[PDB]
Design a protein around this ligand. Structure first.
Ligand SMILES: [Zn+2]
Length: 25
């Protein structure tokens, strides 16, 4: 799953969700 904001490919949506801490809109 590509973050869109930094498109790092997170294998699982859980990780993608967690990764938003990095930007959080
Ligand atoms: Zn990101």
């Amino acid at each position: 799953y590509k973050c869109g904001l930094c498109e790092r490919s997170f294998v699982e949506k859980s990780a993608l969700s967690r990764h938003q801490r990095v930007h959080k809109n």
